[PDB]
Every structure is written in structure tokens, then in C-alpha cells.
PDB file of C-alpha atoms in Angstrom:
ATOM      1  CA  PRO E   1     -13.249  27.684  34.453  1.00  0.00           C
ATOM      2  CA  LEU E   2     -16.098  27.724  31.968  1.00  0.00           C
ATOM      3  CA  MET E   3     -15.760  24.064  30.985  1.00  0.00           C
ATOM      4  CA  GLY E   4     -16.109  23.269  34.676  1.00  0.00           C
ATOM      5  CA  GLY E   5     -13.783  21.674  37.136  1.00  0.00           C
ATOM      6  CA  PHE E   6     -11.601  23.205  39.762  1.00  0.00           C
ATOM      7  CA  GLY E   7      -9.724  26.333  38.783  1.00  0.00           C
ATOM      8  CA  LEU E   8      -6.285  26.241  40.365  1.00  0.00           C
ATOM      9  CA  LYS E   9      -3.751  29.012  40.831  1.00  0.00           C
ATOM     10  CA  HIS E  10      -1.011  26.364  40.884  1.00  0.00           C
ATOM     11  CA  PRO E  11      -2.389  23.388  38.977  1.00  0.00           C
ATOM     12  CA  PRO E  12      -0.850  19.947  38.887  1.00  0.00           C
ATOM     13  CA  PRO E  13       2.466  20.475  37.113  1.00  0.00           C
ATOM     14  CA  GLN E  14       2.523  19.053  33.627  1.00  0.00           C
ATOM     15  CA  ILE E  15       5.074  16.390  32.735  1.00  0.00           C
ATOM     16  CA  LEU E  16       7.208  16.372  29.601  1.00  0.00           C
ATOM     17  CA  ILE E  17       8.955  13.256  28.309  1.00  0.00           C
ATOM     18  CA  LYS E  18      11.156  12.470  25.314  1.00  0.00           C
ATOM     19  CA  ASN E  19      13.453   9.775  24.025  1.00  0.00           C
ATOM     20  CA  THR E  20      17.090  10.706  24.144  1.00  0.00           C
ATOM     21  CA  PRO E  21      18.079  11.005  20.473  1.00  0.00           C
ATOM     22  CA  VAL E  22      20.761   8.496  19.560  1.00  0.00           C
ATOM     23  CA  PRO E  23      22.710   9.505  16.461  1.00  0.00           C
ATOM     24  CA  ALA E  24      23.592   7.139  13.662  1.00  0.00           C
ATOM     25  CA  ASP E  25      27.120   6.770  12.320  1.00  0.00           C
ATOM     26  CA  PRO E  26      28.888  10.123  12.132  1.00  0.00           C
ATOM     27  CA  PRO E  27      31.306  10.502   9.220  1.00  0.00           C
ATOM     28  CA  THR E  28      34.968   9.619   9.480  1.00  0.00           C
ATOM     29  CA  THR E  29      35.999  13.205   8.728  1.00  0.00           C
ATOM     30  CA  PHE E  30      34.794  15.850  11.165  1.00  0.00           C
ATOM     31  CA  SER E  31      32.348  18.448   9.895  1.00  0.00           C
ATOM     32  CA  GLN E  32      30.690  21.413  11.535  1.00  0.00           C
ATOM     33  CA  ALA E  33      27.035  20.553  10.993  1.00  0.00           C
ATOM     34  CA  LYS E  34      24.935  18.778  13.595  1.00  0.00           C
ATOM     35  CA  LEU E  35      24.188  15.105  13.075  1.00  0.00           C
ATOM     36  CA  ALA E  36      21.118  14.682  10.872  1.00  0.00           C
ATOM     37  CA  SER E  37      20.986  10.860  10.917  1.00  0.00           C
ATOM     38  CA  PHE E  38      19.251   9.340  13.937  1.00  0.00           C
ATOM     39  CA  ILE E  39      18.337   5.802  14.948  1.00  0.00           C
ATOM     40  CA  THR E  40      14.584   5.281  14.759  1.00  0.00           C
ATOM     41  CA  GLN E  41      13.405   4.677  18.293  1.00  0.00           C
ATOM     42  CA  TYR E  42      10.383   4.639  20.580  1.00  0.00           C
ATOM     43  CA  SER E  43       9.848   3.635  24.184  1.00  0.00           C
ATOM     44  CA  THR E  44       7.041   2.175  26.279  1.00  0.00           C
ATOM     45  CA  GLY E  45       6.172   1.763  29.927  1.00  0.00           C
ATOM     46  CA  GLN E  46       3.549   1.817  32.638  1.00  0.00           C
ATOM     47  CA  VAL E  47       2.388   5.068  34.253  1.00  0.00           C
ATOM     48  CA  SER E  48       0.398   5.248  37.485  1.00  0.00           C
ATOM     49  CA  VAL E  49      -1.498   8.080  39.134  1.00  0.00           C
ATOM     50  CA  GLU E  50      -3.562   8.347  42.288  1.00  0.00           C
ATOM     51  CA  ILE E  51      -5.661  11.355  43.191  1.00  0.00           C
ATOM     52  CA  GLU E  52      -6.781  11.513  46.784  1.00  0.00           C
ATOM     53  CA  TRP E  53     -10.227  13.070  46.910  1.00  0.00           C
ATOM     54  CA  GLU E  54     -12.214  14.534  49.766  1.00  0.00           C
ATOM     55  CA  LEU E  55     -15.939  13.776  49.736  1.00  0.00           C
ATOM     56  CA  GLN E  56     -18.439  16.107  51.347  1.00  0.00           C
ATOM     57  CA  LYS E  57     -20.824  13.767  53.075  1.00  0.00           C
ATOM     58  CA  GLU E  58     -24.528  14.215  52.580  1.00  0.00           C
ATOM     59  CA  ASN E  59     -27.060  14.727  55.373  1.00  0.00           C
ATOM     60  CA  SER E  60     -30.573  15.460  54.214  1.00  0.00           C
ATOM     61  CA  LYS E  61     -34.007  15.092  55.789  1.00  0.00           C
ATOM     62  CA  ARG E  62     -36.025  14.962  52.558  1.00  0.00           C
ATOM     63  CA  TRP E  63     -38.808  12.428  53.031  1.00  0.00           C
ATOM     64  CA  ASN E  64     -39.552  11.064  49.569  1.00  0.00           C
ATOM     65  CA  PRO E  65     -36.952   9.252  47.442  1.00  0.00           C
ATOM     66  CA  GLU E  66     -34.246  11.120  45.567  1.00  0.00           C
ATOM     67  CA  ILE E  67     -33.314  10.789  41.930  1.00  0.00           C
ATOM     68  CA  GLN E  68     -30.517   8.331  41.230  1.00  0.00           C
ATOM     69  CA  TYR E  69     -28.352   7.456  38.257  1.00  0.00           C
ATOM     70  CA  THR E  70     -29.368   3.959  37.256  1.00  0.00           C
ATOM     71  CA  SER E  71     -28.640   1.661  34.361  1.00  0.00           C
ATOM     72  CA  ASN E  72     -31.376   0.606  31.970  1.00  0.00           C
ATOM     73  CA  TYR E  73     -33.385  -2.331  33.272  1.00  0.00           C
ATOM     74  CA  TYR E  74     -34.585  -3.364  29.808  1.00  0.00           C
ATOM     75  CA  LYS E  75     -32.696  -5.908  27.715  1.00  0.00           C
ATOM     76  CA  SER E  76     -30.141  -4.540  25.277  1.00  0.00           C
ATOM     77  CA  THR E  77     -28.068  -5.836  22.385  1.00  0.00           C
ATOM     78  CA  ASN E  78     -24.833  -5.107  24.238  1.00  0.00           C
ATOM     79  CA  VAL E  79     -23.933  -3.849  27.682  1.00  0.00           C
ATOM     80  CA  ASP E  80     -23.395  -0.118  28.071  1.00  0.00           C
ATOM     81  CA  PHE E  81     -20.042   1.183  29.311  1.00  0.00           C
ATOM     82  CA  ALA E  82     -18.519  -2.128  28.292  1.00  0.00           C
ATOM     83  CA  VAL E  83     -16.921  -3.696  25.284  1.00  0.00           C
ATOM     84  CA  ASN E  84     -18.852  -4.900  22.262  1.00  0.00           C
ATOM     85  CA  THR E  85     -18.256  -7.848  19.955  1.00  0.00           C
ATOM     86  CA  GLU E  86     -15.378  -6.117  18.175  1.00  0.00           C
ATOM     87  CA  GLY E  87     -13.653  -5.333  21.465  1.00  0.00           C
ATOM     88  CA  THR E  88     -14.620  -1.657  21.258  1.00  0.00           C
ATOM     89  CA  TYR E  89     -15.255   0.086  24.561  1.00  0.00           C
ATOM     90  CA  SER E  90     -18.121   2.528  24.082  1.00  0.00           C
ATOM     91  CA  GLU E  91     -19.466   5.012  26.620  1.00  0.00           C
ATOM     92  CA  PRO E  92     -23.080   5.517  25.506  1.00  0.00           C
ATOM     93  CA  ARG E  93     -24.062   8.766  27.223  1.00  0.00           C
ATOM     94  CA  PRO E  94     -22.639  11.569  29.372  1.00  0.00           C
ATOM     95  CA  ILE E  95     -23.042  11.324  33.125  1.00  0.00           C
ATOM     96  CA  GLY E  96     -23.836  14.470  35.060  1.00  0.00           C
ATOM     97  CA  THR E  97     -22.735  15.048  38.618  1.00  0.00           C
ATOM     98  CA  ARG E  98     -25.992  16.473  39.859  1.00  0.00           C
ATOM     99  CA  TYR E  99     -28.684  14.202  41.182  1.00  0.00           C
ATOM    100  CA  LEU E 100     -28.984  14.600  44.937  1.00  0.00           C
ATOM    101  CA  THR E 101     -31.123  17.558  45.913  1.00  0.00           C
ATOM    102  CA  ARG E 102     -30.592  20.370  48.372  1.00  0.00           C
ATOM    103  CA  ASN E 103     -32.402  23.496  49.475  1.00  0.00           C
ATOM    104  CA  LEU E 104     -31.373  26.664  47.679  1.00  0.00           C
TER     105      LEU E 104
ATOM    106  CA  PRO N   1     -40.397 -17.189  57.456  1.00  0.00           C
ATOM    107  CA  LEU N   2     -42.218 -17.374  54.148  1.00  0.00           C
ATOM    108  CA  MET N   3     -43.340 -13.738  54.160  1.00  0.00           C
ATOM    109  CA  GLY N   4     -39.679 -12.841  54.576  1.00  0.00           C
ATOM    110  CA  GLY N   5     -37.809 -11.116  57.322  1.00  0.00           C
ATOM    111  CA  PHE N   6     -35.672 -12.513  60.056  1.00  0.00           C
ATOM    112  CA  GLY N   7     -36.950 -15.623  61.777  1.00  0.00           C
ATOM    113  CA  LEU N   8     -36.140 -15.400  65.469  1.00  0.00           C
ATOM    114  CA  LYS N   9     -36.157 -18.093  68.126  1.00  0.00           C
ATOM    115  CA  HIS N  10     -36.751 -15.378  70.734  1.00  0.00           C
ATOM    116  CA  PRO N  11     -38.394 -12.496  68.894  1.00  0.00           C
ATOM    117  CA  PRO N  12     -38.893  -9.022  70.274  1.00  0.00           C
ATOM    118  CA  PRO N  13     -41.318  -9.522  73.153  1.00  0.00           C
ATOM    119  CA  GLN N  14     -44.770  -8.205  72.426  1.00  0.00           C
ATOM    120  CA  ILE N  15     -46.248  -5.509  74.648  1.00  0.00           C
ATOM    121  CA  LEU N  16     -49.763  -5.532  76.069  1.00  0.00           C
ATOM    122  CA  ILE N  17     -51.473  -2.415  77.407  1.00  0.00           C
ATOM    123  CA  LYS N  18     -54.885  -1.666  78.898  1.00  0.00           C
ATOM    124  CA  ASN N  19     -56.698   1.044  80.787  1.00  0.00           C
ATOM    125  CA  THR N  20     -57.333   0.205  84.392  1.00  0.00           C
ATOM    126  CA  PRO N  21     -61.122  -0.180  84.589  1.00  0.00           C
ATOM    127  CA  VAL N  22     -62.646   2.366  86.940  1.00  0.00           C
ATOM    128  CA  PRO N  23     -66.064   1.313  88.217  1.00  0.00           C
ATOM    129  CA  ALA N  24     -69.043   3.614  88.414  1.00  0.00           C
ATOM    130  CA  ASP N  25     -71.113   4.027  91.565  1.00  0.00           C
ATOM    131  CA  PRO N  26     -71.592   0.715  93.353  1.00  0.00           C
ATOM    132  CA  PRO N  27     -74.941   0.307  95.109  1.00  0.00           C
ATOM    133  CA  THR N  28     -75.488   1.287  98.715  1.00  0.00           C
ATOM    134  CA  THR N  29     -76.355  -2.294  99.671  1.00  0.00           C
ATOM    135  CA  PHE N  30     -73.655  -4.893  99.090  1.00  0.00           C
ATOM    136  CA  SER N  31     -74.312  -7.586  96.511  1.00  0.00           C
ATOM    137  CA  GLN N  32     -72.285 -10.541  95.328  1.00  0.00           C
ATOM    138  CA  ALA N  33     -72.058  -9.787  91.617  1.00  0.00           C
ATOM    139  CA  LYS N  34     -69.113  -7.986  90.063  1.00  0.00           C
ATOM    140  CA  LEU N  35     -69.550  -4.350  89.113  1.00  0.00           C
ATOM    141  CA  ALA N  36     -71.058  -4.068  85.634  1.00  0.00           C
ATOM    142  CA  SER N  37     -71.079  -0.250  85.399  1.00  0.00           C
ATOM    143  CA  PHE N  38     -67.797   1.316  84.299  1.00  0.00           C
ATOM    144  CA  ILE N  39     -66.701   4.860  83.512  1.00  0.00           C
ATOM    145  CA  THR N  40     -66.100   5.284  79.791  1.00  0.00           C
ATOM    146  CA  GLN N  41     -62.411   5.964  79.371  1.00  0.00           C
ATOM    147  CA  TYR N  42     -59.535   5.998  76.902  1.00  0.00           C
ATOM    148  CA  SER N  43     -55.925   7.097  77.113  1.00  0.00           C
ATOM    149  CA  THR N  44     -53.318   8.550  74.771  1.00  0.00           C
ATOM    150  CA  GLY N  45     -49.578   9.050  74.684  1.00  0.00           C
ATOM    151  CA  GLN N  46     -46.371   9.013  72.698  1.00  0.00           C
ATOM    152  CA  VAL N  47     -44.468   5.785  72.004  1.00  0.00           C
ATOM    153  CA  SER N  48     -40.883   5.653  70.751  1.00  0.00           C
ATOM    154  CA  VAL N  49     -38.800   2.827  69.334  1.00  0.00           C
ATOM    155  CA  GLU N  50     -35.274   2.605  67.995  1.00  0.00           C
ATOM    156  CA  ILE N  51     -33.872  -0.425  66.227  1.00  0.00           C
ATOM    157  CA  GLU N  52     -30.120  -0.502  65.899  1.00  0.00           C
ATOM    158  CA  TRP N  53     -29.226  -2.139  62.608  1.00  0.00           C
ATOM    159  CA  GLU N  54     -25.978  -3.564  61.317  1.00  0.00           C
ATOM    160  CA  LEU N  55     -25.234  -2.898  57.649  1.00  0.00           C
ATOM    161  CA  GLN N  56     -23.072  -5.239  55.618  1.00  0.00           C
ATOM    162  CA  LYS N  57     -20.934  -2.908  53.584  1.00  0.00           C
ATOM    163  CA  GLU N  58     -20.618  -3.461  49.876  1.00  0.00           C
ATOM    164  CA  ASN N  59     -17.338  -3.950  48.010  1.00  0.00           C
ATOM    165  CA  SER N  60     -17.705  -4.803  44.355  1.00  0.00           C
ATOM    166  CA  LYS N  61     -15.446  -4.471  41.323  1.00  0.00           C
ATOM    167  CA  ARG N  62     -18.175  -4.489  38.663  1.00  0.00           C
ATOM    168  CA  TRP N  63     -17.182  -2.009  35.968  1.00  0.00           C
ATOM    169  CA  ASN N  64     -20.438  -0.769  34.467  1.00  0.00           C
ATOM    170  CA  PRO N  65     -23.114   1.041  36.500  1.00  0.00           C
ATOM    171  CA  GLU N  66     -25.476  -0.815  38.802  1.00  0.00           C
ATOM    172  CA  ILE N  67     -29.234  -0.571  38.931  1.00  0.00           C
ATOM    173  CA  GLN N  68     -30.573   1.931  41.441  1.00  0.00           C
ATOM    174  CA  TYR N  69     -33.958   2.770  42.899  1.00  0.00           C
ATOM    175  CA  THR N  70     -34.805   6.210  41.588  1.00  0.00           C
ATOM    176  CA  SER N  71     -37.843   8.436  41.617  1.00  0.00           C
ATOM    177  CA  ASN N  72     -39.622   9.351  38.405  1.00  0.00           C
ATOM    178  CA  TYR N  73     -37.995  12.277  36.630  1.00  0.00           C
ATOM    179  CA  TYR N  74     -41.147  13.176  34.692  1.00  0.00           C
ATOM    180  CA  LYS N  75     -43.655  15.700  36.016  1.00  0.00           C
ATOM    181  CA  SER N  76     -46.547  14.323  38.038  1.00  0.00           C
ATOM    182  CA  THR N  77     -49.845  15.581  39.410  1.00  0.00           C
ATOM    183  CA  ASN N  78     -48.705  14.987  42.985  1.00  0.00           C
ATOM    184  CA  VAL N  79     -45.502  13.856  44.632  1.00  0.00           C
ATOM    185  CA  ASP N  80     -45.146  10.152  45.353  1.00  0.00           C
ATOM    186  CA  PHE N  81     -44.617   8.971  48.930  1.00  0.00           C
ATOM    187  CA  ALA N  82     -46.017  12.287  50.101  1.00  0.00           C
ATOM    188  CA  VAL N  83     -49.333  13.801  50.978  1.00  0.00           C
ATOM    189  CA  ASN N  84     -51.902  14.866  48.414  1.00  0.00           C
ATOM    190  CA  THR N  85     -54.355  17.757  48.417  1.00  0.00           C
ATOM    191  CA  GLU N  86     -56.664  16.045  50.904  1.00  0.00           C
ATOM    192  CA  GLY N  87     -53.798  15.402  53.311  1.00  0.00           C
ATOM    193  CA  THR N  88     -53.706  11.699  52.433  1.00  0.00           C
ATOM    194  CA  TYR N  89     -50.302  10.042  52.565  1.00  0.00           C
ATOM    195  CA  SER N  90     -50.101   7.517  49.739  1.00  0.00           C
ATOM    196  CA  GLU N  91     -47.276   5.078  49.037  1.00  0.00           C
ATOM    197  CA  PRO N  92     -47.582   4.452  45.286  1.00  0.00           C
ATOM    198  CA  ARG N  93     -45.618   1.233  44.790  1.00  0.00           C
ATOM    199  CA  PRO N  94     -43.753  -1.468  46.720  1.00  0.00           C
ATOM    200  CA  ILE N  95     -40.008  -1.120  47.115  1.00  0.00           C
ATOM    201  CA  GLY N  96     -37.873  -4.225  46.845  1.00  0.00           C
ATOM    202  CA  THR N  97     -34.617  -4.668  48.691  1.00  0.00           C
ATOM    203  CA  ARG N  98     -32.678  -6.135  45.817  1.00  0.00           C
ATOM    204  CA  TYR N  99     -30.868  -3.892  43.399  1.00  0.00           C
ATOM    205  CA  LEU N 100     -27.126  -4.184  43.914  1.00  0.00           C
ATOM    206  CA  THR N 101     -25.646  -7.162  42.121  1.00  0.00           C
ATOM    207  CA  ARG N 102     -23.289  -9.886  43.245  1.00  0.00           C
ATOM    208  CA  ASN N 103     -21.751 -13.020  41.806  1.00  0.00           C
ATOM    209  CA  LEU N 104     -23.647 -16.214  42.527  1.00  0.00           C
TER     210      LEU N 104
ATOM    211  CA  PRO I   1     -20.738 -30.519  45.136  1.00  0.00           C
ATOM    212  CA  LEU I   2     -22.307 -33.140  42.909  1.00  0.00           C
ATOM    213  CA  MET I   3     -19.096 -33.996  41.057  1.00  0.00           C
ATOM    214  CA  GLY I   4     -17.570 -34.669  44.462  1.00  0.00           C
ATOM    215  CA  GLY I   5     -14.755 -33.048  46.322  1.00  0.00           C
ATOM    216  CA  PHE I   6     -14.803 -30.545  49.101  1.00  0.00           C
ATOM    217  CA  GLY I   7     -17.298 -27.726  48.793  1.00  0.00           C
ATOM    218  CA  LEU I   8     -15.716 -24.543  50.096  1.00  0.00           C
ATOM    219  CA  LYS I   9     -17.317 -21.254  51.061  1.00  0.00           C
ATOM    220  CA  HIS I  10     -14.001 -19.532  50.311  1.00  0.00           C
ATOM    221  CA  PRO I  11     -12.196 -21.764  47.830  1.00  0.00           C
ATOM    222  CA  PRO I  12      -8.577 -21.434  46.823  1.00  0.00           C
ATOM    223  CA  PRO I  13      -8.429 -18.089  45.031  1.00  0.00           C
ATOM    224  CA  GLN I  14      -7.972 -18.423  41.309  1.00  0.00           C
ATOM    225  CA  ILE I  15      -4.937 -16.862  39.650  1.00  0.00           C
ATOM    226  CA  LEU I  16      -5.006 -14.782  36.482  1.00  0.00           C
ATOM    227  CA  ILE I  17      -1.915 -14.122  34.374  1.00  0.00           C
ATOM    228  CA  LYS I  18      -1.227 -12.233  31.152  1.00  0.00           C
ATOM    229  CA  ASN I  19       1.657 -10.915  29.116  1.00  0.00           C
ATOM    230  CA  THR I  20       2.008  -7.177  29.236  1.00  0.00           C
ATOM    231  CA  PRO I  21       1.147  -6.063  25.692  1.00  0.00           C
ATOM    232  CA  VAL I  22       4.079  -4.330  24.042  1.00  0.00           C
ATOM    233  CA  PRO I  23       3.020  -2.089  21.165  1.00  0.00           C
ATOM    234  CA  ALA I  24       4.774  -1.966  17.831  1.00  0.00           C
ATOM    235  CA  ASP I  25       5.917   1.276  16.229  1.00  0.00           C
ATOM    236  CA  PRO I  26       3.376   4.047  16.747  1.00  0.00           C
ATOM    237  CA  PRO I  27       3.090   6.521  13.872  1.00  0.00           C
ATOM    238  CA  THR I  28       5.141   9.686  13.690  1.00  0.00           C
ATOM    239  CA  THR I  29       2.010  11.850  13.762  1.00  0.00           C
ATOM    240  CA  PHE I  30      -0.194  11.522  16.831  1.00  0.00           C
ATOM    241  CA  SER I  31      -3.670  10.089  16.374  1.00  0.00           C
ATOM    242  CA  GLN I  32      -6.509   9.455  18.775  1.00  0.00           C
ATOM    243  CA  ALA I  33      -7.034   5.734  18.263  1.00  0.00           C
ATOM    244  CA  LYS I  34      -5.446   3.110  20.485  1.00  0.00           C
ATOM    245  CA  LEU I  35      -2.459   1.215  19.143  1.00  0.00           C
ATOM    246  CA  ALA I  36      -3.605  -1.774  17.092  1.00  0.00           C
ATOM    247  CA  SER I  37      -0.144  -3.150  16.224  1.00  0.00           C
ATOM    248  CA  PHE I  38       1.432  -5.353  18.888  1.00  0.00           C
ATOM    249  CA  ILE I  39       4.620  -7.398  19.073  1.00  0.00           C
ATOM    250  CA  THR I  40       3.841 -11.109  18.990  1.00  0.00           C
ATOM    251  CA  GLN I  41       4.885 -12.499  22.340  1.00  0.00           C
ATOM    252  CA  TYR I  42       4.511 -15.417  24.728  1.00  0.00           C
ATOM    253  CA  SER I  43       6.147 -16.333  28.011  1.00  0.00           C
ATOM    254  CA  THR I  44       7.094 -19.510  29.858  1.00  0.00           C
ATOM    255  CA  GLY I  45       8.091 -20.546  33.345  1.00  0.00           C
ATOM    256  CA  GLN I  46       7.865 -23.067  36.142  1.00  0.00           C
ATOM    257  CA  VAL I  47       4.920 -23.138  38.560  1.00  0.00           C
ATOM    258  CA  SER I  48       4.911 -25.031  41.854  1.00  0.00           C
ATOM    259  CA  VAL I  49       2.119 -25.932  44.247  1.00  0.00           C
ATOM    260  CA  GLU I  50       1.990 -27.866  47.491  1.00  0.00           C
ATOM    261  CA  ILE I  51      -1.213 -28.886  49.216  1.00  0.00           C
ATOM    262  CA  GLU I  52      -0.831 -29.972  52.802  1.00  0.00           C
ATOM    263  CA  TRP I  53      -3.333 -32.721  53.507  1.00  0.00           C
ATOM    264  CA  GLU I  54      -4.605 -34.184  56.746  1.00  0.00           C
ATOM    265  CA  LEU I  55      -5.121 -37.950  56.759  1.00  0.00           C
ATOM    266  CA  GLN I  56      -7.659 -39.586  59.030  1.00  0.00           C
ATOM    267  CA  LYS I  57      -5.862 -42.642  60.286  1.00  0.00           C
ATOM    268  CA  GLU I  58      -7.587 -45.984  60.137  1.00  0.00           C
ATOM    269  CA  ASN I  59      -8.182 -48.272  63.119  1.00  0.00           C
ATOM    270  CA  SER I  60     -10.269 -51.325  62.385  1.00  0.00           C
ATOM    271  CA  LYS I  61     -10.651 -54.725  64.028  1.00  0.00           C
ATOM    272  CA  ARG I  62     -11.980 -56.601  60.989  1.00  0.00           C
ATOM    273  CA  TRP I  63     -10.443 -60.071  61.006  1.00  0.00           C
ATOM    274  CA  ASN I  64     -10.292 -61.142  57.368  1.00  0.00           C
ATOM    275  CA  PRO I  65      -8.324 -59.230  54.715  1.00  0.00           C
ATOM    276  CA  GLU I  66      -9.621 -56.022  53.185  1.00  0.00           C
ATOM    277  CA  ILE I  67      -9.917 -55.167  49.525  1.00  0.00           C
ATOM    278  CA  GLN I  68      -6.943 -53.313  48.087  1.00  0.00           C
ATOM    279  CA  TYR I  69      -6.179 -51.488  44.867  1.00  0.00           C
ATOM    280  CA  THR I  70      -3.558 -53.569  43.116  1.00  0.00           C
ATOM    281  CA  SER I  71      -1.939 -53.567  39.716  1.00  0.00           C
ATOM    282  CA  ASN I  72      -2.446 -56.444  37.310  1.00  0.00           C
ATOM    283  CA  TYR I  73      -0.088 -59.332  37.987  1.00  0.00           C
ATOM    284  CA  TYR I  74      -0.386 -60.725  34.455  1.00  0.00           C
ATOM    285  CA  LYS I  75       2.032 -59.726  31.701  1.00  0.00           C
ATOM    286  CA  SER I  76       1.002 -56.810  29.514  1.00  0.00           C
ATOM    287  CA  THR I  77       2.140 -55.210  26.276  1.00  0.00           C
ATOM    288  CA  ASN I  78       2.974 -51.956  28.052  1.00  0.00           C
ATOM    289  CA  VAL I  79       2.965 -50.773  31.636  1.00  0.00           C
ATOM    290  CA  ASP I  80      -0.176 -49.053  32.878  1.00  0.00           C
ATOM    291  CA  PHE I  81       0.022 -45.487  34.190  1.00  0.00           C
ATOM    292  CA  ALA I  82       3.288 -45.109  32.315  1.00  0.00           C
ATOM    293  CA  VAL I  83       4.492 -44.045  28.927  1.00  0.00           C
ATOM    294  CA  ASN I  84       4.224 -46.195  25.827  1.00  0.00           C
ATOM    295  CA  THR I  85       6.540 -46.545  22.846  1.00  0.00           C
ATOM    296  CA  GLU I  86       5.446 -43.219  21.364  1.00  0.00           C
ATOM    297  CA  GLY I  87       6.098 -41.407  24.636  1.00  0.00           C
ATOM    298  CA  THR I  88       2.376 -41.114  25.378  1.00  0.00           C
ATOM    299  CA  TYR I  89       1.393 -41.218  29.036  1.00  0.00           C
ATOM    300  CA  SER I  90      -1.879 -43.116  29.331  1.00  0.00           C
ATOM    301  CA  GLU I  91      -3.957 -43.631  32.469  1.00  0.00           C
ATOM    302  CA  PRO I  92      -5.858 -46.856  31.730  1.00  0.00           C
ATOM    303  CA  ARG I  93      -8.719 -46.758  34.234  1.00  0.00           C
ATOM    304  CA  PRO I  94     -10.292 -44.546  36.904  1.00  0.00           C
ATOM    305  CA  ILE I  95      -9.270 -45.090  40.505  1.00  0.00           C
ATOM    306  CA  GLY I  96     -11.923 -44.855  43.183  1.00  0.00           C
ATOM    307  CA  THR I  97     -11.218 -43.706  46.704  1.00  0.00           C
ATOM    308  CA  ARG I  98     -13.263 -46.344  48.445  1.00  0.00           C
ATOM    309  CA  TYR I  99     -11.729 -49.660  49.343  1.00  0.00           C
ATOM    310  CA  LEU I 100     -11.263 -49.898  53.095  1.00  0.00           C
ATOM    311  CA  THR I 101     -14.413 -50.973  54.880  1.00  0.00           C
ATOM    312  CA  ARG I 102     -16.206 -49.607  57.907  1.00  0.00           C
ATOM    313  CA  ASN I 103     -19.373 -50.318  59.836  1.00  0.00           C
ATOM    314  CA  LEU I 104     -22.379 -48.270  58.797  1.00  0.00           C
TER     315      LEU I 104
END
């Protein structure tokens, strides 16, 4: 896939979820039409997901140090990747997956 | 120890090595004094050492990224921690052991 | 520890507790932002703790009487370490742990 990530011929199956509609008072006298009056409703809950990954371990004889993803050592007004005064979580920058080096 | 490193009450035993002195021609007529004429000599060889270390693995729940020791991303006239044009291996800077963080 | 009490290299683990936030009505039309409207909530309950102590028993040959922590024998307007007319529990004075005597 162009955006990246693993193309799958049978991806993780998507999940669809809906409240069961609960109709308001139907009339006393029967009528053909479907019930257009519903009880306003919404639900909540906790959803959990694990994804078990396989890591390809790295064995490399390169002498000098690699490049590593490291946080800024200099003082800052607020910590990156963490909440600010308002309670607003802010990811400052994108994080690539390529740092370690290998021989073409 | 002030310089750092593990103080040991029975350190790794030091190793002493010397050529066996091989005397030049002694005189035909015996004389009391020790032989002062030796055959100029030196030896060479290959020495190997392993040191089996125990690592204390790191388990930490800190959310935001750590600090990491990383090589300079910007172009340079010659690679650090590696030989230069003359064949001279040069370590540019000292490397501390403290980067990962922990709660006091 | 300076304040006193047992210093522990692995103290009793602290316990953290929170209500699960229950969001109010989300809008009919989806929107990116997190839900800022929550249902005002608080919980109650009963918490119990035992701490099993070991006492170091006291064996001492001192002839004359010791010093002991004793309540005031003289009449008072209200009992110490017990509620007053308003229902206010009031501890009058601090209670040290040292009374029994021992040879240095």
C-alpha cells in the first residue's frame, strides 16, 4: 500500500456496532407505517485490543555509533508527547521507523 | 573508587611477562661476576580476553521518549570514532553511561 | 528517614483509584475532538487494612518503677482523645514511643 504498512489479502475484519433502536409509544390504533418515534439513546463501554508483534532482531558489526531517535536535551516550555497546561496532549513531530543502518 | 568503576576486594590478578635473558658469549676463563653481555631480543604475540558481563534489564513505564546517545546527523569531513586519511583512529568525545532515566 | 519510621527499599505499594469517566450525550454528527461533556459522578465505599506487627518483648531487671504514659487523674472539662460537645474528636498532645528504659 502506498501510504505504507502491511498489505493484507485478508485484513483484520472490521467491526460494526449499533444501539438497538427502542421505539417510543406506538399509537393505540394499528397503522401500517413503521414507527418513526424513537427513544434518544447512546451507549458507552471499554474496548481492548492486543496485537502480538514479531520483531526481527538486529545483528550488525558496524564499528562507529548508529543514529538514534532521542528527545531534545535543551529546556522547553512544556514536555513533548505529553499534556500541556490546558490538558491537551500534543504530539510535536512525526517519528520515522528508519534509523538503524544496514548494507544495501 | 573515585575514578569510578567497580571496587574489588580481590581484583583481576595482574599478569607479568618478560623475555628470558639469553647471555652472549661468556669468557673462556671463569670469573665470578654475572654475565653483563646479553643478546638483544624482543618477542611478540596475540593476547585475547573475554569479560562476561551481566546486564540489568530495563523496565520503565515513562510515556514520552527517553534521551539516547546518537551520532551527528549532519555531514562531516571525516567519520567520528573511525580512522582518518592518515590512518589515525580518533575518538572525538567522551561517552557517558547515563542516559536512561529512573525515579529517584 | 529523618521524620522517623522504617525506611524501606520496597515500601508498601501505593494504590491509585479513579472513577471511570462516563461521557454525556455525544453529538449526532461525528466530530474529531474528544468528548468534553461528562456526567458528574463520585463513588464511596469501605476500605480495610491490617498491619501485622512484631513486638520485641521486654525483659529488664531494673528494681524501681519505670516511667509510664498515663492519663491525667485530675478532673477535666472534656475527656482527652475523645469527642467533645460538638462531636469534634481532638487529640490533645503528641505521644512519644520512648518510656521504658534500657542500658546504653
